[PDB]
């Protein structure tokens, strides 16, 4: 399920479908378990929503035309794929995520205005 | 809005003020039964109190469960009352009068 | 009272089941007049009911 | 001017009872409280009780609860103080004084603003 | 499943799972007593022997 | 009995200023706005000069003034004439249904 943790970005770029699969299950007892069973679908729907706004409904490694403002990392590829791992990298880029997302939304939408004109 | 769920029967306590002026609102003003709602532009500061100094007594009713009731009274008994400033009230009442005369 | 007009409390006493056992004892309390209604089927004013 | 008149003097044995009077004039006698205060010779003042003229419901310090009876007679504007079980300690001068106004919406009963006294009556327990 | 190249922090005394477990077992305890007999008439006077 | 402790006596001479005080408790003096002062001298019933902390009755003695802070109430004199020779008493509403007095004190003049 999560054996790819601690590995490099190149390593866990493969077997992402292993993590993508296992996010739904449950059955019923009353007060809490039902509350524990609408959390799964709600979490999955939110994570799919944010991926679908950015034109990335295909659950691949989705690639984007929004520039990497160097202030976000000020770091180079050579120090990243060879050694660095996902959680450790996430602790860095986490300082800018909410700013990044809206740019993805709008860029998807200008790509949309470009596609429609016929 | 932040709704204030306070309860009252003849005067709307602690409510939010009117929009810009005293406004009257009703389902059908011509009908008697439709209870009209009058919304005021300025508040009238009411104050109420009970001068008596009650004290509470612990009576026991069966196993484990208590029941409270008023014991003696320590002060000298007086009348519980409410107070409203007259000059505010009469002026506000006349303003409601003109807003009623708009429709009558 | 001889004179004046104020609220008054109508001191009342009742035979409640006591804190322990199904033993009984007497107890007293005060009740505002709207909470109390005269009972008596005969013309007597020494016996009262709660409005419940 | 407003003034209160009092009994002359009393002499009693221990275990007996004493009644002292306090008649007032010059103001509407029902509109003010009456405060009773005791003065032992060459010693501190001891406040004793108060009474509302229009009703009963006296109250007094715990030294004298269940032992002092209090009434007023509306006919002749006279208040009366009853001490029922005397001790040798109770030898002192007894005063009556007019208290705060009897408001119908505010509790002025406990207010120390009394401003008109009697002559003081000397009670001797011997 | 074992993770090969990871490291984490743990805290016994700030752990949340205990603060849920207590509520769980208190609630499950309370279910078992709801349909059962309530006693209450047993509070009556008890006269007992002088066993010696 | 009374919590209104008071000094025993003072003394002075013409033109001086003297401040009497009484210490009560948080229950009575430190909770209510109803301290008052009284005086008496032999052969006479006592007399009022300060009521409700600092206000004056009819006529007598604008000279006297008083105030309270914490559990302490005070009466202030200045000029200190011969008529001020009297036994001054501390008084306060004691909470509940009771007023309570202090021990009293003599102003030795002049
Ligand atoms: C909600 O709203 C309610 C209202 O609807 C409200 O209830 C009201 O609250 C107020 C505020 O708390 C209460 O006000 C009190 O009123 C008391 C009574 O006041 C009236 O009566 C007296 C006496 O009147 C007689 O004597 C005068 C002469 O003095 C005559 O001219 C009169 O005609 C009258 O005559 C008698 O004989 C007639 C014969 O037929 C009778 O018909 C008649 O009934 C009488 O028996 C008047 O003096 C009062 O006037 C005062 O006010 C005017 C206007 O400001 C002044 O110009 C005037 O000089 C007076 O000051 C009024 O007419 C008051 O006693 C009380 O004030 C005193 O007590 C309080 C409490 O202790 C003190 O804080 C205050 O400082 C006052 O103390 C002085 O007086 C008392 C005794 O009166 C003394 O014990 C005290 O030591 C001090 O006197 C000494 O010092 C004086 C110098 O400072 C000196 O002058 C004195 O001589 C003495 O040395 C207070 O004002 C009101 O009663 C409530 N309403 C009712 C119905 O009770 C309620 O609070 C509200 N609630 C809320 C939550 O908001
Ligand atoms: C409304 O009613 C309520 C009751 O329902 C009233 O509340 C009561 O108020 C009284 C005050 O009048 C208060 O009495 C005190 O109780 C304490 C016990 O809890 C006592 O310790 C205290 O005694 C000390 O103070 C007295 C003077 O106030 C002295 O006479 C006595 O000797 C004690 O003094 C010694 O101790 C103190 C403290 O250590 C020290 O500073 C002194 O120097 C001295 O050494 C009082 O008896 C009740 O406790 C109150 N009850 C409740 C339940 O709160 C209320 O006042 C009423 N209000 C109105 C407006 O009427
Ligand atoms: C209410 O009435 C009851 C009696 O019905 C009073 O209770 C008595 O009080 C006196 C005075 O302390 C005692 O001698 C009796 O022992 C009490 N009797 C009982 C049965 O408790 C009570 O004091 C009254 N209270 C008020 C506020 O009026």
Nearest chain D residue to C1 by CA: give it: D55
B and A touch with 3+ CB pairs <8 Å, answer: no
In whole angstroms, how large is the CA radius of gyration of chain A? 18
Contact residues, chain F, for D95 at CB < 8 Å: 45
Token readout for F74 is 């005070």
Cα D74 to ligand 1 centroid, rounded to whole Å: 22
- CA–CA separation, C34 and A25 (whole Å): 60
Contact at 8 Å (CB) between C35 and C42?
Answer: no
Q: For residue C31, give the ligand nearest its CA.
A: 3
Contact at 8 Å (CB) between D35 and D22?
Answer: no
- CA–CA separation, A72 and C7 (whole Å): 75
- CA–CA separation, B46 and B14 (whole Å): 10
Angle (CA) F101 F104 F107, round 5°: 145
Token readout for B21 is 């002026």
**Beta strand pairing call for B37-39 and B23-25:** antiparallel
Contact at 8 Å (CB) between F56 and F43?
Answer: no
Contact at 8 Å (CB) between F33 and D113?
Answer: no
- CA–CA separation, F89 and D39 (whole Å): 12
For tokens 């009644």, the residue is D19
Does the beta carbon of D61 lie under 8 angstroms from any beta carbon of chain B? no
Nearest chain C residue to B71 by CA: give it: C29
D53 lines ligand 1 (CB under 6 A): no
- CA–CA separation, D94 and D89 (whole Å): 13
Cα F36 to ligand 2 centroid, rounded to whole Å: 19
Contact check, Cβ <8 Å, D106/B78: yes
| Minimal C-alpha gap between D33 and chain C (Å) | 15
Give the mutation target among F1, F2, F27 for probing the ligand 2 site: most ligand atoms within 8 A of CB. F27
Does the beta carbon of C23 lie under 8 angstroms from any beta carbon of chain E? yes
Q: Which long-range contacts (CB under 8 A, 24 or more apart) does A74-83 make?
A: A80/A9, A81/A8, A81/A9, A81/A10, A82/A8, A83/A8
- CA–CA separation, F41 and D46 (whole Å): 17
Side-chain half-sphere CA neighbours of F39 within 13 A: 17
Contact check, Cβ <8 Å, D112/F46: no
B77 lines ligand 2 (CB under 6 A): no
For residue B38, CA distances in Å to A38, B9, B33, B93, B101 come to: 46, 14, 15, 11, 13
- CA–CA separation, B16 and B5 (whole Å): 11
For tokens 């009092």, the residue is D6
C13 lines ligand 3 (CB under 6 A): yes
Token readout for F11 is 């003394």
- CB contacts < 8 A, C to D, total 11
Give the mutation target among C9, C11, C27 for probing the ligand 3 site: most ligand atoms within 8 A of CB. C11
Does the beta carbon of D56 lie under 8 angstroms from any beta carbon of chain B? no
For residue E26, CA distances in Å to A32, D19, E15 come to: 14, 69, 18
For residue A42, CA distances in Å to A5, A28, A35, F1 come to: 24, 17, 11, 71
Residue D84 CB contacts under 8 Å (≥ 6 apart), including other chains: D17, D67, D68, D69
| Minimal C-alpha gap between C22 and chain B (Å) | 8
Closest to D107 in 3D by CA, of B100, B54, B35? B54
Angle (CA) D7 D9 D12, round 5°: 120
Distance of CA D94 to the CA centre of its chain: 7
Q: Which experimental technique did the depositors report for determining this structure?
A: cryo-EM
Crossing angle for the helix pair A35-53 and A97-116, to the nearest 10 degrees: 60
Closest to D78 in 3D by CA, of D121, D29, D8, D10? D29
Q: What is the DSSP letter of D35?
A: E
| Minimal C-alpha gap between D11 and chain B (Å) | 34
Nearest chain B residue to C22 by CA: give it: B62
Segment holding F90, helix H or strand E:
strand F87-93
Please give the resolution of this entry in Å, rounded to 1 decimal.
4.2
Segment holding A10, helix H or strand E:
helix A9-13
Sheet with D18-25: list strands edge to edge. Answer: D3-6, D18-25, D78-83, D68-73
For tokens 């770091």, the residue is A75
Contact at 8 Å (CB) between F110 and F18?
Answer: no
Closest to F64 in 3D by CA, of F36, F43, F42, F91? F36
| Minimal C-alpha gap between F66 and chain D (Å) | 15
- CA–CA separation, A53 and A108 (whole Å): 8
Does the beta carbon of F105 lie under 8 angstroms from any beta carbon of chain D? no
Residue of the nearest CA to atom 12 in ligand 3?
Answer: D66
Among B60, B63, B79, the residue with its CB nearest the CB of C6 is B79
For tokens 């794929």, the residue is A81
| Minimal C-alpha gap between B44 and chain C (Å) | 27
Backbone dihedral region of F39: left (phi > 0), alpha (psi from -120 to 50 degrees) or beta? beta
Residue B3: what are its φ and ψ, rounded to 5°? -85, 130
Residue C3 CB contacts under 8 Å (≥ 6 apart), including other chains: D54, D55, D74
Does the beta carbon of F96 lie under 8 angstroms from any beta carbon of chain B? yes
Contact residues, chain E, for A88 at CB < 8 Å: none
Q: What is the DSSP letter of A79?
A: G
Nearest chain D residue to F100 by CA: give it: D47
Contact residues, chain C, for B72 at CB < 8 Å: 30
- CA–CA separation, C11 and C16 (whole Å): 16
């Amino acid at each position: 399920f999560l054996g790819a943790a601690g590995s490099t970005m190149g390593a866990a770029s493969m077997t992402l479908t292993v993590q993508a699969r296992n996010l739904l299950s449950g059955t019923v007892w009353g007060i809490k378990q039902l509350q524990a069973r609408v959390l799964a679908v709600e979490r999955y729907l939110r994570d799919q929503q944010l991926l679908g706004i950015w034109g990335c409904s295909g659950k691949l490694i989705c690639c984007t035309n929004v520039p990497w403002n160097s202030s976000w990392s000020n770091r180079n590829l050579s120090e990243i794929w060879d050694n660095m791992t996902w959680l450790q990298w996430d602790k860095e880029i986490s300082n800018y995520t909410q700013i990044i997302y809206g740019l993805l939304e709008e860029s998807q939408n200008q790509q949309e205005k470009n596609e429609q004109d016929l | 809005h932040g709704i204030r769920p306070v309860v009252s029967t003849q005067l709307l306590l602690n409510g939010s003020l009117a929009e810009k002026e005293i406004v009257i609102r009703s389902e059908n003003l011509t009908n008697n039964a439709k209870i009209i709602i009058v919304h005021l532009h300025t508040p009238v500061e009411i104050v109420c109190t009970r001068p008596n100094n009650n004290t509470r007594k612990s009576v026991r009713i069966g196993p484990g469960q208590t029941f409270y009731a008023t014991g003696d009274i320590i002060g000298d008994i007086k009348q519980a009352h409410c107070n409203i400033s007259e000059e505010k009230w009469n002026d506000t009442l006349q303003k409601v009068g003109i807003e009623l005369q708009k429709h009558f | 009272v001889k004179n004046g007009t104020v609220e008054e409390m109508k001191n009342c006493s009742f035979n409640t089941t006591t804190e322990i056992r199904d033993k009984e004892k007497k107890e007293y309390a005060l009740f505002y007049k709207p909470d109390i209604v005269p009972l008596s089927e005969t013309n007597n004013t020494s016996e009262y009911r709660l409005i419940n | 001017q407003v003034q209160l008149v009092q009994s002359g003097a009393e002499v009693k044995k221990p275990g007996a009872s004493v009644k002292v009077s306090c008649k007032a004039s010059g103001y509407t006698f029902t509109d003010y409280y009456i405060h009773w205060v005791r003065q032992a010779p060459g010693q501190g003042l001891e406040w004793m009780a108060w009474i509302n003229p229009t009703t009963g419901r006296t109250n007094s310090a715990r030294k004298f609860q269940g032992r002092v009876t209090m009434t007023r007679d509306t006919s002749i504007s006279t208040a009366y103080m009853e001490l029922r079980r005397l001790r040798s300690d109770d030898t002192a001068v007894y005063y009556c004084a007019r208290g705060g106004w009897i408001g119908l919406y505010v509790d002025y009963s406990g207010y120390p603003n009394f401003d008109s006294w009697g002559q003081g009556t000397l009670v001797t327990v011997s | 499943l074992v993770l090969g190249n990871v490291t984490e922090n743990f805290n016994m005394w700030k752990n949340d799972m205990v603060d849920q477990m207590h509520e769980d077992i208190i609630s499950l305890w309370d279910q078992s007593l709801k349909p059962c007999v309530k006693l209450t008439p047993l509070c009556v006077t008890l006269i007992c022997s002088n066993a010696t | 009995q009374s919590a209104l402790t008071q000094p025993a006596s003072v003394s002075g001479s013409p033109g001086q200023s003297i401040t009497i005080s009484c210490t009560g408790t948080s229950y009575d003096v430190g909770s209510y706005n109803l301290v008052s002062w009284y005086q008496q001298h032999p052969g006479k019933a006592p007399k009022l000069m300060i009521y409700e902390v600092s206000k004056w009755p009819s006529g007598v003695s604008n000279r006297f003034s008083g105030s309270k802070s914490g559990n302490t109430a005070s009466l202030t004199i200045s000029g200190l004439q011969a008529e001020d020779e009297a036994d001054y008493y501390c008084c306060s509403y004691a909470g509940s249904s009771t007023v309570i007095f202090g021990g009293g004190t003599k102003l030795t003049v002049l």
